[PDB]
């Protein structure tokens, strides 16, 4: 787990797993209760 914090900032996280929207999928589900400016930092939107 802990080693994987290093990636979420990156602009190419779904490099080869189909998707490329998961990001925009979790700026919505768990994203309104939390800071919709706070999470979008954590991923780097």
């Amino acid at each position: 787990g802990q080693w994987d914090r290093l990636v979420l900032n990156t602009p190419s996280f779904p490099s080869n797993y189909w998707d490329k929207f998961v990001k925009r999928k979790v700026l919505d589900k768990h994203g309104d209760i939390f800071g919709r400016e706070r999470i979008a930092e954590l991923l780097g939107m």
Partner: protein, 48 residues
């Protein structure tokens, strides 16, 4: 559960935690689990 969340720490400014009613109205409107007319009934349940 709303009052323990991390969203309310982006609205408390006073050292005694005395959130103003003008700020709490936008606060529960931000965390949008509530409904429209219910959040002003909650205003009248507090003390000014």
């Amino acid at each position: 559960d709303i009052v323990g969340s991390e969203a309310f720490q982006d609205y408390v400014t006073d050292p005694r935690g005395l959130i103003s009613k003008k700020d709490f109205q936008k606060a529960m409107d931000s965390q949008k689990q509530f409904t429209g007319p219910e959040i002003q009934f909650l205003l009248s349940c507090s003390e000014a």
